[model samples]
Target: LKCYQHGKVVTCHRDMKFCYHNTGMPFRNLKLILQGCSSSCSETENNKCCSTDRCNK
Candidate 1:
């Protein structure tokens, strides 16, 4: 799959099936943006995952 990493588009390995978007802290002052490919998709309060090209973007 294709994902967004470090503001660039990247092709993930075959083992990676999902794109992930995570934040350090959205409710507080420190808000971080993290994006990459993941082998598994786990949804959480501060994390999101999808299974499509550039879905994390």
Candidate 2:
């Protein structure tokens, strides 16, 4: 997918490091860290781009 998306590799890039320490603000901080991203893809084929679920929960 990254290769097809103009070489853009989608990563968690999600402030995942900070929240591991019981920071109590993981959700908010992570959201803020990834705030500049689009909430979701506007097209049907790129639907996956719209999701922000955790990699593992």
Candidate 3:
């Protein structure tokens, strides 16, 4: 799978079946953005998943 990791595009392990994107409020009220390959992802208020290349973007 192809996805975005950190701030760059990357190719993941072949076993990865989806691209994941998520946002969160961590310590100190900081906002966090994460995007990468996932073997599985479930629907959630702060998370999203896609099956196409670079879909996490």
Candidate 4:
């Protein structure tokens, strides 16, 4: 299965979703990341963004 939402911690965030971040990428401690909502991003925005890509954790 292609978990596109799996590896997106360092790649995305609450401000820039679907973004390609080169640094801060998750290397370990994925459990904590997922627990903190840093694993899967929502499909909707948080009033700040209208329709653009935005991650929330």
Candidate 5:
């Protein structure tokens, strides 16, 4: 799943290791720390897919 943070699209994957505890935030909110980002993708800039569940590997 993916989401936007600080104008960047956060791509969540099983191998991800950039979160606070290496655990990507299930929901993109202030409580969760965003440590990974890539080139911005506006269409999905405001969307959160993993927020519903998680990135099912």
Candidate 6:
């Protein structure tokens, strides 16, 4: 998944639920990068996005 944070594109290899910084939370941890967004993004505007054409798979 991909997220636009401060205009820079952030990529994640799994499904995500939120973009951390927008809520004053710490940036996604390097370890969590492989874990996708946390468990609550579905309720916010911090929607999941694609990083590449193949990322949709």
lDDT of 4 by residue, 1-57 (tens): 111234543333454333222223356754323312223334333212222333322
Best model number under lDDT: 1
User: Candidate 1 residues 1-57, lDDT tens each?
Assistant: 688865787887757888889874555554578777779968776788888988877
Residue 2 lDDT, candidate 5, scale 0-100: 51
Clashing pairs in 6: 16-37, 17-41
Error of 3 at 53 (Å): 0.5
Using Cα atoms with residue i matched to residue i, what is each candidate's TM-score against the true structure?
0.74, 0.16, 0.73, 0.16, 0.18, 0.25
C-alpha RMSD of candidate 6: 8.8
Give the root-mean-square deviation of each candidate in angstroms: 3.1, 13.4, 2.4, 11.0, 12.0, 8.8
Query: CA shift at 6, candidate 4, in angstroms?
Result: 2.0
In model 5, which residue pairs have backbone atoms overlapping below 3 Å? none
**Candidate that beats the other on TM-score, 3 or 5, i.e. the better one:** 3
User: What is the lDDT ranking, best to worst?
Assistant: 1, 3, 6, 5, 4, 2
The prediction achieving the highest TM-score against the true structure is 1
lDDT of 2 at 23: 21
Worst 10 residues of 3 by lDDT: 23-32
Query: How high a TM-score does candidate 3 get?
Result: 0.73
RMSD of 5: 12.0
Query: How many collisions between residues are there in candidate 4?
Result: 1
Residue-pair clashes per candidate: 0, 1, 0, 1, 0, 2
In order, candidate lDDTs are 0.78, 0.27, 0.74, 0.31, 0.37, 0.39
